[PDB]
Design a protein around this ligand. Structure first.
Ligand code: LYS
Ligand code: LYS
Ligand code: LYS
Ligand code: LYS
Ligand code: CL
Ligand code: CL
Ligand code: CL
Ligand code: V
Lengths: 253, 250, 251, 253
């Protein structure tokens, strides 16, 4: 562990990725607000991901918090899932140091074409969403920050739902979200995911959701949220931090 | 109401549409499988639509039937709504005669670029879908026939759902629908509707659904399904006629 | 030759296509007005294509006719190439019999989802275009008939131009083409082609052109034009390939 | 003139734009790399544009230089036009102060969602392209800098060509442009322009060109090239500055 994680990851990335291949991924990240790291574009060693998935499975069994609400700041889109707060995930030494790894952040900076600053709100650095029932979903929303590295730790079959639908090049107006109006004006990109996949999401300008589960399954994702230069010194508004506080102002039943 | 509907509709369409403007609509029908007749592109007189809605409102109050199921031939997509069967709507002399009007079918033939044939199954000539509860939806599906003229008689606010999402240039494999896999590989066109709107839908090659209602509202449409030349002599399979039979095998 | 072509092509296609995978090509054909037949999806055996190309190279060396005009029926788009008339290509029994093959038409009918009828005008059944100079191009245009199977016999590198740009879901108004206005309203699909490729084109409802050659190269195609039930009244006086002095042809 | 330009433009823009409507223009500028200021979305008063045009028409009649070459850094795409160099346009007092106007840059910063810095190379600050012959065109290319405010001063009829064809979400590789391979992979957006139009262009990540003139006409633009935070401290490369030096290293006739 320790610095060997950064050293092994730096070797793990130098075997598959070049500046030219990263520049092609950067063009896709701007066009879609989304790039996927699957079997043909792996991001972390399989042993490292297994250690992260085992850490998340332990945090879930210890700190599972069921959520079933609607967020008024996002057009009353539902939040039907179980979550693990950011303060509980920070206690994991593996997830915390990896989220601030100068190797992982520096490499992904070539895809975002801008600095990836790990300075966000202490209640939003990390988030684990655990969907396991029918109609569980992460409704249409944006992100308060610019970037998010989501770990598709557990993915149900595609025929069972759970895909990530996205609409890039949008914005979040918490007083007038216009989610259904944006769908009428813009085409929706549906991104299928499999267990083990990772993907970078430009969360501030991509209206995105997860297709609700069509039956009882299991959908687990670890969220690593990072801020850009535009997110610094900005005031957090909305009173809609539903994951940390289930009784937030914007959180309705 | 009498045989003067065709004479008035022919004048109604001649006042608004030319062969060149219809050709522009025919291009939009092939690219999206969908052409909307909204406030700026009316299809029928408002007094004719009012008489159609009043006939449908009476059919709903007399013959509405709740449906709550999933269709295995469409990837187990839900069908949560109330329906009025085709044999009941056929009793309406206004709806039945208008659905075979040589003026209406001859005009829409310029958009479909082929003959519109009013010779479909007797259980699918007409259909009224009436949603009014939260999560009510017409799930992802295709149509056994090519064409369908849908009357957006009543639509909730856009913020309450009920929009039509469509994926053109697809096909229906009842043994392997591949609905969620098609979504991952194809962009979804969401089409907002308003009360009074009408739209022509290429139902056989456009995967379409209605966005579920986010809360209790009211969503009423009338479906006039017609056949193309490709649909004649074709045998119906799937055992999935859920609207006519709520216990349809599929 | 003989009837062994249809027997060989039927076994060739039966080993590469299922009704389900053909239905996937039908969706792409209605969506893009274009379906390419490259190495991943071959259409004819390499021996059949070689005999066809050799016949086309002979027809070019014997009856090549240079064209350099503008067609007013398509917004004065240029036509700079060499052509071979359908009446000369129809002399080749191979190209003629293959164009009416029930196995070939029956298979491609599963992509168009409608009958492919080989009953078109006698001056438009076949066409060979041979571009070899800089700025040679087949300008923006439509087709008077619905279908066309183009044989990308010889293609220059993509850096020398020659790609097929297409805009599907359009129509041809010979009195008001509105090509540049259509380009401003729609996206352009550029389809790269390599030597040996084939592709089906929905010519009546797809505005298409070939990118002009950026330098002296060699671009050769063989056009196999068919008709649907829609095409069973030719107007415009713009048949430039058969008549270089058409009323719509300018300079 | 003088300081009255900023006070008149502030008002002109305060009556035709809201923060909510500029955000809608920001979404379009990110999705297409291009946003047009036409009759329904004017940017400058008609009296200011008339003075800007009259200045450019004088700079053309005095310092126009013909160009007819191919740029090897952009796949040998042609440059058939007449140009006025940046140092000559810099002599105009009106164009110089307007390009650095804190009101114009501040308003357009809401569309780019990032600071617009008027600190670019002294040979690429401004540029006027003047096409008037058949086959004249500004071939497929990218921009060394991020932003460019282009003034469609005189546009021929659309049937005579001259539209702006763009492909957003790309990047410039001077050693391997892959212009024709990018077109085969991406859809082209054609943007028709009329005389009097203005448009913002994300020049660094949008592969764009001008459709060649189908006949002898007149096509005149004014380029106001600006930089972002990413363009600062970056070394210029390629030796392909054809507009300033017709005999550049990457310039071939
Ligand atoms: N803001 C999103 C969730 C982001 C939290 C994860 N960092 C929502 O309200 O649904
Ligand atoms: N195929 C439709 C039913 C058609 C009835 C209306 N023409 C469905 O699965 O919902
Ligand atoms: N109509 C086409 C020519 C067709 C040649 C035979 N398929 C044109 O305008 O160029
Ligand atoms: N890079 C451009 C020139 C830009 C000049 C000022 N924007 C070209 O190759 O034509
Ligand atoms: Cl987010
Ligand atoms: Cl249907
Ligand atoms: Cl053609
Ligand atoms: V053609």
């Amino acid at each position: 562990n320790v610095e060997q994680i950064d050293e092994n990851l730096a070797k793990f990335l130098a075997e598959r990725y070049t500046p030219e291949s990263v520049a092609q991924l950067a063009d896709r990240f701007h066009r879609f607000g989304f790039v996927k790291f699957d079997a043909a574009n792996r991001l972390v060693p399989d042993e490292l991901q297994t250690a992260v998935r085992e850490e998340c499975d332990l945090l879930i069994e210890q700190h599972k918090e069921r959520r079933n609400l609607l967020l008024s700041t996002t057009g009353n889109t539902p939040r039907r899932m179980s979550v693990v707060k950011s303060e509980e995930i920070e206690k994991s030494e593996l997830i915390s140091t990896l989220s601030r790894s100068e190797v992982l952040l520096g490499f992904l900076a070539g895809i975002t074409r801008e600095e990836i600053i790990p300075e966000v709100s202490s209640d939003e650095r990390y988030l684990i969403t655990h969907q396991e029932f029918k109609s569980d979903t992460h409704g249409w929303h944006w992100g308060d920050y610019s970037f998010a590295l989501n770990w598709a730790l557990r993915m149900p079959p595609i025929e069972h739902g759970g895909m990530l639908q996205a609409v890039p090049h949008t914005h979040w107006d918490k007083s007038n979200p216009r989610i259904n109006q944006t769908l009428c004006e813009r085409e929706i990109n549906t991104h299928g995911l499999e267990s083990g996949d990772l993907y970078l999401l430009r969360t501030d300008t991509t209206l995105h959701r997860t297709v609700p589960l069509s039956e009882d399954s299991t959908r687990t994702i670890l969220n690593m949220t990072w801020a850009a230069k535009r997110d610094l010194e900005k005031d957090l508004v909305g009173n809609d931090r539903w994951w940390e506080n289930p009784e937030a102002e914007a959180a309705r039943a």
